[PDB]
Design a protein around this ligand. Structure first.
Ligand SMILES: C=C(O[C@H]1[C@H](O)[C@@H](CO)O[C@H](OP(=O)(O)OP(=O)(O)OC[C@H]2O[C@@H](n3ccc(=O)[nH]c3=O)[C@H](O)[C@@H]2O)[C@@H]1NC(C)=O)C(=O)O
Ligand SMILES: C=C(O[C@H]1[C@H](O)[C@@H](CO)O[C@H](OP(=O)(O)OP(=O)(O)OC[C@H]2O[C@@H](n3ccc(=O)[nH]c3=O)[C@H](O)[C@@H]2O)[C@@H]1NC(C)=O)C(=O)O
Ligand SMILES: C=C(O[C@H]1[C@H](O)[C@@H](CO)O[C@H](OP(=O)(O)OP(=O)(O)OC[C@H]2O[C@@H](n3ccc(=O)[nH]c3=O)[C@H](O)[C@@H]2O)[C@@H]1NC(C)=O)C(=O)O
Ligand SMILES: C=C(O[C@H]1[C@H](O)[C@@H](CO)O[C@H](OP(=O)(O)OP(=O)(O)OC[C@H]2O[C@@H](n3ccc(=O)[nH]c3=O)[C@H](O)[C@@H]2O)[C@@H]1NC(C)=O)C(=O)O
Lengths: 419, 419, 419, 419
């Protein structure tokens, strides 16, 4: 069991080049199951979930290889199932269902169980596919979708704003018979990116980025080349790294308009921010951050994927900060760990009341989930002494060589084994 | 203290002509304060809040008169305060602050207190105005806004989706210097309608209806004519009226695209729905409704203003219905009253678990707020016997002579005094 | 519509003699319906609810008269129903059901509708009576109970801790055949007082004050004399009055052991407290209170009836105070009103985050419920200038001559009309 | 990674002998650190946490050994710290802090991090120890307690009911100077058992079992023998086993009065229950269970440790069952897993709405915590086909060879490896 040994404090400054978005690459890779012709996806980060995805696709009969790009040839998909073994390691596997039933009339994916940050049901994915004409049956833990011929467009109103269900329904609808409308669709940048990818293959989609998406089905989708957009969560993570360590940083290969909420909050924390077409610079001028109030919600509001990072920022900020999480019911696992490092906080239902302290103390902590692990590593960077973050494999799920990029910013970090 | 005597059951059927939206006419009436020339607002419903608004505007030195339209001449606005006496009867008065400070550099409005359905703070309106350059102070219960010269455009990210704050900021921004961007803005049809009204006066606005509104300030706004859009909640209320009484109805002067969530839910309840350019028909074919699941949220999701009405529908429906209110913290006051009529429900935090019964029993109940009073009246129409709904003055706030429109559908309803 | 016009600031100091507990007097007065012989209840406060109760009792055929005591003669009961008109003014009327069905085999009470501070169902009262053998029906909004002969003892486990339901079940059980056991009973001081009252009439009760109450039914209860214990909420209210005005007070005719949580919280706020056998003294030594954290819960935890008062204390205290209400879902109505007076707070689900300020500003505010009204009045006492608390009739429901007692502490208060 | 392969459906019937309470043995074993003379604890179950506890004690310089009993000689404790590597595997280790600082004036325990079912802070333990005079510092993740001389009795009011904090405070108070009073103490049967154990060593404690515990400190505690009470949760687990499989079972070595809430709920589910002095019999007479409503809360209310089990019972019961969890914020992890087996449920905040189905389908599921793992195993016993419960090491924490006991009841179970 790998761990990260961090010695602080250290001001983090310099530059970092943002990788392609984990959450755009994933839905795109699955959307590729719709392509009857070779597809090249560019700027795909090297993450654990990308590997698991390539594995799942290959197991479906797809020809896959990668480097900076991932080349896909799904012309001969001949297997339509995602076994429990793979699904249990990556719930995103659920995104295989829509494309498979939409193009081949069938698909079986193991129903994901519970997740670290919440129950995370997939009822909206199922609801959507059923509205498109698919028949869904659950047997032996497998959601089994089927349709005789082509799915049929339908006007669907979402009971909840869901990034995942939006991707599933929008993706399957591209090969449906007629027009599909997704009312109360997720507006996240990754939805836009996945939509534009599908359109690149020959799909007809409009409204991506708004509350209502309109898809006009076609008989088939071809191939092509598409470059994934910048990872806004990675970008925010590094901006937070500078913001909490009195440093300065410039993020290259970034897309500023995907982060208005985060940037505005960073400015309120006292950060001096400047943005360009493809870059963002943040300078704390050696100042300690000011406490801010945050409420997560669907894009363009403050993103839940930056919540643990801002929880850390408030814990070392001057003043009382309040963090309200409205997306996932169990996403405060980093709090108890930060408390071990000397932080002061109280959890009241889905809100964390933070009382910032001058400095944290190095201690042994445990990563419980992707964003939580990144926060613990950042905490280790600014804490006094040695911090050992156990189970950092979590971090390898959504950050490409975070270790090197942090070191390049002045961090004293070492990856160690010792199970 | 007026009351409503309703005798049932009665299958409600026929037609109704939807009035102009209460929640579009109000923000527009206040936005009119920005007009330097005569303005005519058409299709304005005759509601208690419209009367209070006319008095408030008059008290600001505005010349006001009405019938179907409301004619406004705010060329000579010479007073800039909204007193506690008026604000305490209508919190919407808060909408006078932005236009006043934007056009005259000053404005004072009594800070609204607690509301029946929630604390409903206005911190976001104040925040927005401050971001536009206004200096805000609270003294003696009055929020006093001021700015030296014109307000200045700014990029504002909303910590919460707010219909009211969106109106305040968007309205004030039309006269600000430069460009204003509202990130995570409310998307309600009434926001769209208010934006279009401001545009008709000469304002420059785009993005209304999406989560990002862009306003380019101008030196001043003129006058003109604008017709308020159909009231979607009144429409939904009457559609429910037929849906729960096994009836049929046709709503005239309606705008179907403002009710996708509501219509979708009525179909799930078993309703046969048809829509035209400006009309909506619903036929229950004598059926008892089927229990549905609802979760209120910002437009285009299911609206909180239809929540009590659907709570009623589920309480007389087949099966177990679940209603989750995420907008207001005290909007279940109709439940205890419906329970007095034989309904079976349990409140669990912000969710109501409903167990539909065949028929309700007439009983004496108390209206506590606008939408709940409408639900109790509808309940009276379908319950067995006589139902007396006390304090129906609440209903005259958002419905234009509802007993008449209901009587034309076959309701045995009478307005009595007896304090 | 009476109001309290209060001039501040004024330090509150001196002495106050605590009246009998409103919440002990009420359940005992209803318990008296079980008495076949004359009963005298001493130390009964003069409150609106006592008058409504004496009114309801008289209406049942009981002979009632009062002064310091209330003399009851229920040897004859010629009517067994509590009308809607009365119940609507006092939900506590529900307590007439149990004694009536237990002694006469019949009784009916109008099902209470919604309450200002919550839905407050009475399902547990009904459940308990049904477990004791009563048949319950709901017709025309009335709860109708009946039993052929005597009720029979049962082992009942309460799904939730309820003061009211514990009173109903314990009271009815006294005339039941056999032994009754109430598991997970409320342990409030008033339950202990009502049990001791019943025992004085000849009932056999043990465990009152613990989570399991054992009642041994007897054929009939006689008469007697019983003194109601001191009102702990009135006591806490006056202690807070001193704590938030830098004052020093001595509460006479008090019972310290019923207020451990409150006293401990006041000490944490910086109050110097001393207690005797029947008195409590509190001295703030001119200090501003220190913010505290509070979580309401069943006795002996911090009581929800002191929640609004402590919210006020935190809003004028030094630091960040947190109030969490777990009993009633709508008991923060005082917050929006205090905010009108310059307080700073945010409500997050069932928790209020307070940011204490130096001085409040006098303003026009509205009382919404009993404890809230008392808090607004205290706020007026320490605020700068003139505060007008509308609808103070709410305060006359549970405070005997609060105006006089406050004036005797130095308050500049005046009860004015002017509707 | 061990797993359980279960084959269903198999009716569970027969007998089981209840082991000593896991949650009584643990606090007692730590309380033993106060004993200056040899102690023998009887009826201690063989569980993972007991082993970890013996390791921790041993490492403090304690002489420990076991079989049915555990013999402790803590006369020579020479080390006062519980390392991170031990506490990370068992947060109950926190219970070493109080005894150590109370008897030796010092002690340091690694502050526990996050837990599977919630953040579970220990702020109340620290608060209590500080009130007893201990100085608490946090450094490098270790909570360091110290006091010069002996702790001093104090009147402590818990602003939340905590089993753990109650144990910590009550344990340390036994050696304190003077009288300590714990207001709003936990009333769990294990608190009673731990208090009687301390009393057996020479401590002076009264009130155990009520919301107020009084402890009179003494100079030192001797040795002795004490038998741990029956495990009510294990008992409840096996009673549910029979109740959901239409079986009949008898639990030996049980203590009925510790399960009033659970038995009452089982009867409501249709179970025929009889109890003796030390046994409990439950017969379902081949009937399918009836859906019940549950709300966890401090003893004697329904226990949170039986919540997952009852979630299961409702998922295979007739009707709609509602489970509300008020103790831990993340204890619904079993729901997603049961859903994979064909169950129908929706999670609404802290409530689960269940829609019972006839039969579950065997599938691969994952144990997430102790009670959840037991629930999944039981589900496997009644499900149709093969069920594989991964990570059953969780079950070995609180159940002594559950495999054998279930098999003795007719279950087709087998522990397999295969990582
Ligand atoms: C957790 C991460 O990323 C997450 C990110 O937090 C969320 C929210 O923006 O959207 C993606 O998941 P997701 O698709 O499961 O998110 P959502 O579907 O939007 O879930 C939002 C809310 O809806 C609920 N939900 C979702 C689907 C459904 O059928 N039913 C349902 O009730 C969720 O359980 C939650 O209560 C990202 N993952 C990918 C692979 O695209 C991370 O990388 O750190
Ligand atoms: C209640 C009615 O209508 C309401 C309707 O329910 C709501 C929601 O769609 O939007 C209008 O009020 P509103 O402007 O106060 O609504 P919002 O601002 O959107 O409030 C939404 C949520 O944000 C909160 N909120 C709002 C403003 C602010 O500064 N801060 C804040 O925290 C609210 O208290 C609530 O928790 C309608 N009223 C008018 C006059 O336009 C009705 O007619 O029955
Ligand atoms: C509100 C006041 O006093 C109240 C005090 O707050 C509460 C709590 O201690 O106990 C008395 O009411 P109560 O009898 O209605 O209180 P409870 O029954 O204990 O209610 C507690 C919780 O249980 C719920 N509840 C109660 C009864 C029932 O059948 N079902 C149920 O769900 C409540 O709605 C609430 O969510 C006092 N009133 C009298 C007349 O004795 C006041 O005087 O200011
Ligand atoms: C989880 C198990 O058992 C648990 C059982 O659920 C709970 C509740 O009855 O009481 C014991 O834990 P515990 O001591 O941590 O329980 P509690 O202290 O009572 O916690 C109750 C509530 O108070 C909170 N809490 C507790 C202590 C504190 O200092 N602060 C605090 O906020 C908790 O996080 C929770 O929100 C049992 N464990 C042992 C080893 O005795 C199990 O065996 O499955």
């Amino acid at each position: 069991m790998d761990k990260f040994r961090v010695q602080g404090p250290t001001r983090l400054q310099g530059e970092v080049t943002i990788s392609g978005a984990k959450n755009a690459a994933l839905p795109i890779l699955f959307a590729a199951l719709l392509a009857e012709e070779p597809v090249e996806i560019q700027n795909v980060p090297k993450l654990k979930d990308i590997d698991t995805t390539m594995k799942l696709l290959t197991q479906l009969g797809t020809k896959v290889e990668r480097x900076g790009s991932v080349w896909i040839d799904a012309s001969n998909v001949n297997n339509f199932s995602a076994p429990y073994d793979l699904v249990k390691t990556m719930r995103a596997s659920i995104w295989a269902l829509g494309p498979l039933v939409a193009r081949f009339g069938q698909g079986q994916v193991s129903l994901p169980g519970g997740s670290a940050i919440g129950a995370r049901p997939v009822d909206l994915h199922i609801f959507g596919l059923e509205k498109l004409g698919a028949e869904i049956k659950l047997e032996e833990g497998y959601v089994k979708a089927s349709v005789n011929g082509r799915l049929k467009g339908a006007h669907i109103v979402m009971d909840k704003v869901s990034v995942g269900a939006t991707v599933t329904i929008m993706s399957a609808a591209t090969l449906a018979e007629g027009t599909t409308i997704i009312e109360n669709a997720a507006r996240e940048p990754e939805i836009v990116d996945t939509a534009n990818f599908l359109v690149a293959l020959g799909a007809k989609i409009s409204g991506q980025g708004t509350d209502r998406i309109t898809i006009e089905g076609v008989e088939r989708l071809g191939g092509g080349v598409y470059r994934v957009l910048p990872d806004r969560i990675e970008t925010g993570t590094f901006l937070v790294a500078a913001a909490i360590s009195g440093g300065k940083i410039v993020c290259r290969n970034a897309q500023p308009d995907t982060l208005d909420a985060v940037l505005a909050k960073l400015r309120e924390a006292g950060a001096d921010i400047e943005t360009g077409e493809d870059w963002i610079s943040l300078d704390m001028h050696g100042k300690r951050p000011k406490a801010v109030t945050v409420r997560t919600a669907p894009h363009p509001a403050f993103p839940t994927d930056m919540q643990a990072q801002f929880t850390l920022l408030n814990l070392v900020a001057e003043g009382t900060g309040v963090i309200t999480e409205t997306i996932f019911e169990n996403r405060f696992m980093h709090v108890p760990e930060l408390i071990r490092m000397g932080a002061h906080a109280e959890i009241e239902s889905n809100t964390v009341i933070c009382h910032g302290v001058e400095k944290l103390s190095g201690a042994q902590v445990m990563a419980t989930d992707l964003r939580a692990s990144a926060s613990l590593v950042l905490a280790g960077c600014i804490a006094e002494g040695t911090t050992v973050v156990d189970r950092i494999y979590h971090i390898d799920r959504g950050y490409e060589r975070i270790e090197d990029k942090l070191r390049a910013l002045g961090a004293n970090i070492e990856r160690v084994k010792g199970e």
